[model samples]
Target: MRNRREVSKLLSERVLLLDGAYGTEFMKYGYDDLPEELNIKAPDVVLKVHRSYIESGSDVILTNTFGATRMKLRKHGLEDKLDPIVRNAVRIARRAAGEKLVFGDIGPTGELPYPLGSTLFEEFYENFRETVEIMVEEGVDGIIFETFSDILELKAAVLAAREVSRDVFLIAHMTFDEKGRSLTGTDPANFAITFDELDIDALGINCSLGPEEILPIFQELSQYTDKFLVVEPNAGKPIVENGKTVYPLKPHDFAVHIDSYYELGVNIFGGCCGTTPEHVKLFRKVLGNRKPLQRKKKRIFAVSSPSKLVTFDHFVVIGERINPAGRKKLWAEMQKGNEEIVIKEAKTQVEKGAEVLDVNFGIESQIDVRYVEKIVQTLPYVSNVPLSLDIQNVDLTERALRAYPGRSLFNSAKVDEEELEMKINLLKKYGGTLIVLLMGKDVPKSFEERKEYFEKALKILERHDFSDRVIFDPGVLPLGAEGKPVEVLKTIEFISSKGFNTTVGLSNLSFGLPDRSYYNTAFLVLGISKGLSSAIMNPLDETLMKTLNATLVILEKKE
Candidate 1:
């Protein structure tokens, strides 16, 4: 009686079996060799296939309209039939689902948007607006944007769907390659961050890759965002035999893989390309009796240039928000002879429950070079957390390290032979924590290259007979400006799996965007799960603090 509005609440109780690949069903319904004209001309055949899926234990059924939009239909000479086809498809799915959930299927237009391809913005938006309007009127429970290659286009469809109804859940999905990268070069974690901004009910990936290929990324995505995770991978890649592509993963094998997704924090289970009701049924059997999983870990820490401690183990936090690296005013002040802002920001971080305070007084704006004396003076009387000095000046670093009370960490130096020795001597004399970058002056650009640097850095620190005195960072890349975000994530995963502590700038992930704080927070949570020991951040951002705290709870990094 409540309709399918309560379907979302079910996502947490147990995995929902979303029926697979309507196109594959369409293949058997007299459209295998021909175009998709048969879907509209023969609604009964499509309806029968959907009804059969529901009968076979599919809990949620997608409408047979992945490509029923005006533009795509027009390509098949059925442009004028958009409303009739979508409405009928929804009605059929609704009838088939009955008391069950019926999701309106919205797949991508194969053509890329302008500049990327030929599809004009206005033209594509208008086409999508029409389809969403028709689908909304049909009382669909939610909109599923599937098999999309580009993030901008996925944003387009999500916006268009939102314009029609805020009540219905929107499932934003993407297709990825074996590289765990989208065709538009998006990492799965970035997809979650982007959609978290769009404010959709759920975000996910479907089609393109198989279970094994996507599970590792799912592990990363699970750590990256708080949004609901949806995964509907192809049973497996297709193989060409007798001129037809075939997928080898049987329904039971696919279902077994779906179990791992739930364990990895995925909430929705479905299939794509060459999947069937048998797959959904097998998924139901394997996942139905099992309670949803919660992420496991405890008091996660990252050690790079700074030792960032989040006490989910205790309720303490180290505030790292006061650095002036990216701030013009604070840097200008640090340059123009006023170090008071640095003191104020440090105190602010401490007052906000920071268990430790990271101090980075390096001012490229300053020719004065008295950063250590100025900032360290304030810590004696004002801050609560231990001081973490982030500076490049050895003279200044020595000055601060000597002045600070209690245990603290030296900000860091690169992996170059000369610099490492300088920092080691300082760390030995000062007897505090040390942070090290996985790169040197001769650092390589690839992950393979960076690991070599990390090894050498590790060796040099060892050669100095270093004990438990250091942390490492492979250097997480920016979302837009660098090599690739996933590559950075993979490197972090490797670091964590190897049981080494790590740290990140945390805020730098938002470099090329508007309202960077949003992405910054998302990236921090991600960094934690991937073996981040500490972070270099502005502890003052409330949203980011909340995300960090929540991540601690989720990862069991807290007591």
Candidate 2:
């Protein structure tokens, strides 16, 4: 097997050629039986299709297992043959591939998620999980979840694949209608952002549309994501003629349209429905030795759940009321394992315009580790807001991070080397944003001293590969005591000038003051003027939230 990491590096060097459609080939061969059954019933038919693509100069060939899932097969009374069918498909593709890579194709479960369909989330996972387990056992090179229209269903498929093996390369593609949105109402931009948040190796559009139709969708996706983009449009629109559906574009025409996508910064290329080896061969010729366009690096700093996102396009408010810092009523509810208050707290914050939630189960002694675990797991169900896991306990933090379904924020990493190492490792292991404080053992009083420590911390973060994922907090200090707010403001200005996403605990600046909300709201406006990307504040405070929203509109509104 080729190294999956090296495959990603290869994409940067040149566009990868994935094999064309398997169903089209099966149709061409006049196979009336289930397409997956041909894997065992007539292995020659499957092998012939795989070999045709290989001879056409394709770099990767997907197995003939798109509809081999138990759910899809159950309709034909072949659910019991999933293991043999999927394994046989992989074996044939591997034989045909020789030195080339073979991706085990996993398609949708042919059922929608709850409130729309009867399939439970766990059922979707198990169906994909069972199929992937057999495919992995057979030693395929990678996996691809293609032509998925439902974002929620795709999440289940992705989580199942990751649960099986993080090492295997995974590609996710969503099918968009001519209206440029999925049937579930996910637009191209939303599709790209949602997939980019996952651990998938590449994301793109495929099926339901031809190359010409996919061009705009591809362009919209490129603007939002920096991940390797793959494009495998159908040969052309289908038309009913002589009681058979026919695609309008020929092989050369298909290849001609695909070249435009390559020029638009696509890293992977292939054909979908109605395309065959003839199309792949022409694609290989037109794209001969041609490198992919240099894609610009995406700078949209955001954290997300499986279905939701919180981008820092403007001032983002992360609701700070979920924590039990000063709320005795909330802490008392936690003792009895009643998260009614916690759930209410999250929903109210979001209603008041909180883009993210700050979850802290109090300090060590006051924290119930079990309660923290339960709250972390349950919060996503009640509210769609992405969380900032704000606990100090390292083990407890990991538990919460892993349990949460989406990318989360790890609250703070001090200048202390010992604790910084642990925090960076957690960020790497579980994928999310990291907050690095601009202070060391002793708080820096002067701007120059603070800048010195911030730069030093950046070096440490750079070494750990947290450069893009780390956000710097200038260490906001409470007024009327301790450090000064102006010093932190200076640090924020310096960091913002460099164009890094900056965040702060907004309420921290007004501690020990009677008119706390008034003071916090005033300082938040100043922070936004100086380029604060986000803040931790009380989202329930209508006056403060109103001030924050108005500032964001002024800064981000367009004519």
Candidate 3:
């Protein structure tokens, strides 16, 4: 696990270069119709294309299964032969790579999910899974889910990859605009969060955005999550030049941002549509001398999950004010806390820019447990963003998990051996999400102990096969208590190095300080640069919201 970070560290030391566009390479071979039944009809040309990337200093080359799913291939009247083509594509890429990273490429099927379209989750899973199984059989180094506007399609493919291969790495990249938002409106931060939660090896924005445009998302991603960042952008947006699509970005123009991107923390570099080895070579020259940004990273989602993202290219924090842990009025109500107060608070949080609401019904009332179900059911009707049920009771979490329709987050899981194990089981059983606090027997103490707990939590998650389902929040203690922000930051860095998803309840750091919102928001923005994904905070705080949004734009979260 540590080696993954070390390897990523090594990759970032000097730009870890990857090959240019595989699709464009195919176009060069005179294969006019992409995703056509070319494998059965013209295998030689495809093999040659794969060979070209390997010859061009491409550390990684992609398989030709970008549109090989049965549903996707059906458009080309080759649905029946999807499996064979995918299998052979991997075999060819493997042969082509020789020793390079041969990524098993998966793309959207050009269709939508059920309700929006006809594809059901389970059915969609099966078709995608078949493609993954074929990749596994042929044995590729990794898989890249590319050109996805709909995150549902990305998730489906990732889930399929997880089901089929444990050894192979995967990259979940979406096409985003200059504003760092996706066609589906998914941005870099949120995309990084979900990818980290799912335990993706690498992530980034690719396709639609160009080098300069991608810089913000990449820089933001560097700050967002500690996962391996791969920046594979189009040559630039296309324009009609001589009746052909031409991207305006030149290799030298790209090289300028390439060095800046490397400085910003991106390690892996490649080209997307309209890119060529010429551009990749230019990147190699400019990026070769610099050390890749080796900081730990974390990303969070902004738009809704299960579909296209509306990338906000910035950090959006929802202040967690509804939880009645200490407020007098809230505590008094907790003593008699009813659904009305809870619902009202939840609505208030959302109205304040809280994309998701956190509901913590502790043991203030005997009916606290029962109120869990009611809160979950009512909040979504009030706000479309998901819910984060903050509770210590397993029963309450189970109820909330069932009540929520879309994906939601858990308030937390502590660093106790027995408690952590139990919490993981609950998450899996209820299909729940989790936030793993890096504070245990040795933690909320020294920074080293906190790192140990963070590492331990990750290790535990790995053991339970729930690593992908957990988010690492190295419990932020009051900064004034021991002034352990440095330690907390170290713990965060370690967590990011291991490529685990992470978040922080930002307000904790400012708990005992005066006018703490300033420090809290400032720290929150700093954390973003250090890979702090989503923070549980009061979104209504102008300082926090401003700093977060500013961080995203400064980082170029979008164009």
Candidate 4:
């Protein structure tokens, strides 16, 4: 027997039932102390409850270390003895689990990351790193970070877990409000779109609403991700009767709602709040060795912030004002390490009409890596949408991606063999989409020449995985030269015919032309009609965005 070394592979064999409600169960057994303390203060109470879960058909149990991170421990004056408490929690969980899987539990630090609260992203990483290292050292089958509300906080936890052990199965989850938004405003599709680029084994929701209330939310999430899905819903909303809180959902009722998620393709199941041994028992009985069904995966092109999500389902307008290429004043200020103008451009474009912003710090040999990080880090606070990093410096690109919170658009790459590998590896390491120019060299004048480079670059990307990770740029040519605007449309149709996304540097079509607004806007409408997904252009051009609005509504593309 291969000790659950492969939890994801084992998941395909049969649905695994996780345990439920340690705090509530402890409450039921008359332990009023904080949950983590019981791990060391009353170890037998924790062990007995865990064993009760296993006997009732829980295939997986998690250690009682949910609130034991150093940050929280410091608040409660238990910071110094964290290891002892966590080690005891793991021992109790292992004793109860026997040969079954015991996943170490890590939850959010009560404080939020900076801007929301007073904590840095790496500070959050170390807070989680402290728990995860001990959890892995204590030898658990996996680590599950659950009950997070902010995607950024969860990301740090997941990143920290990955830093600790690649072999351990990592399950990450965040709680959502009734409207299917995380407390930080990430919708289900947005959550899936962002997390899809990360290195995670299973992604799902838990501890928010009852299974019935959360069904539609989880259903929406199911549409966008094929990662092994795990869900745990509270038994029901808590009600205070004579000042004591109660959860109304019984075992069968909770199991009935979970059955619907099973049909929608959840792989692991559990409960929260008021669920007892009976609730987990029903989960096992209903599943009855049933294997999880295969799910069709989605390749959603989008990016998000803690509060906003911008998807490519509509005509994506990426604001192109952040580049220091043409604006001399802006370029000179940036050289002085001042991004006041860059930040201003970033906010105004999104305010006007841009859904995504493109950031291109021009190539100067004197550019500092830390300077790039400052701009990338600062943008998240002001512009809560995703960014397209159009930096030409490879080290700077990697640096910006490292400092970024959500998945960013690596804008972009060319068809050169060596260059394509460097960028593709960035997407693999830092999880995001790529834009590949259709030509390997200078603008190829012929459609066939462009297609040859397109095919070569595509063939290269598909060598490792599928092509949804790529957004193919049908190279643009100056319209004044060959009236070549139509040339890009022809390539757009071909890429669109293959169901691939298309992006273009729109302003280039009107290069050096007088009254360029109409020229660029006209090409955008024509391009969209040919199945263009997005464009990098001046969103501040009032006429272009107005025409864009009229065109999308006329084509029924606006939601």
Candidate 1: tens digits of C-alpha lDDT, residues 507-531: 6677677787887777666667666
Q: Tell me the spans in candidate 3 whose CA falls farther than 4 Å from its real position.
A: 1-14, 242-244, 289-291, 297-383, 389-407, 411-420, 425-559
- Best model number under TM-score: 4
Per-model lDDT: 0.68, 0.81, 0.69, 0.83
Sorted by lDDT (best first), the order is 4, 2, 3, 1
Considering only N, C-alpha and C atoms within 3 Å, which residue pairs clash in candidate 2?
A: none
Candidate 4 error regions (>4 Å): 1-5, 281-287, 332-343, 364-371, 374-381, 441-443, 477-486, 509-514, 553-559
Model 2 lDDT per residue over 311-387, tens place: 77767788898877788888788766676788888888888888888888776566676667557655654576678
If both were scored by lDDT, which would come out higher, candidate 2 or candidate 4?
4
Comparing 2 with 3 on TM-score, the higher-scoring candidate is 2
How high a TM-score does candidate 3 get?
Answer: 0.61
lDDT of 3 at 317: 52
RMSD of each: 20.0, 4.6, 11.1, 3.0
Give the winner by lDDT: 2 or 3. Answer: 2
Better of 1 and 2 by TM-score: 2
The prediction achieving the highest lDDT against the true structure is 4
Q: Which ten residues in a row have the lowest lDDT in candidate 2?
A: 113-122
Over the full model, what C-alpha lDDT does candidate 2 score relative to the true structure? 0.81
